[PDB]
């Protein structure tokens, strides 16, 4: 069912679900998965307001199409970002880091799953990269 649809989802251009892209914050590491567990909190403080969109884990980079504006916000790529990283709070929050090469510094973006399950997006992304290097 779920995986029976997520199997070809990443292969297409949408293997995730509604998300809460808070924005982007600065970090000082970009060499660990725990770095995202902290950034997610920073964006939860203030300034960076969350957005209700639709994360589409595509094998050629993620894409968050707003579900209230459809103007898109995250036109980045999976192979472009340093490396993904979940959390250890409630598995309802994920984030990715992106150092220099486009920001001239370490900048990690954070977001949260509006589905609350830790499978419709988590495991989905964990399979995206596995297919990204298929060739």
């Amino acid at each position: 069912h779920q995986w029976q649809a997520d199997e070809e989802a990443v292969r297409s251009a949408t293997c995730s679900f509604s998300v809460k892209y808070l924005g982007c914050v600065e970090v000082f590491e970009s060499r660990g998965m725990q770095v995202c567990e902290e950034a997610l909190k920073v964006l939860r403080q203030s300034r960076r307001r969350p957005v209700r969109g639709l994360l589409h884990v595509s094998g050629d980079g993620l894409r968050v199409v707003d579900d209230e504006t459809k103007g898109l916000i995250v036109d980045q790529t999976i192979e472009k970002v340093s490396f993904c990283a979940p959390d250890r709070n409630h598995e309802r929050g994920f984030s990715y880091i992106c150092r220099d090469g486009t920001t001239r510094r370490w900048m990690c973006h954070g977001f949260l799953a509006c589905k609350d399950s830790g499978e419709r997006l988590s495991h989905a992304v964990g399979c995206a990269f596995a297919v990204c290097l298929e060739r």
Binding site: M33, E79, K80, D100, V125, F129
Partner: peptide, 11 residues
């Protein structure tokens, strides 16, 4: 606890 591997390895 995962991370992409098909990265282009940025400087």
């Amino acid at each position: 606890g995962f991370s992409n591997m098909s990265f282009e390895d940025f400087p």
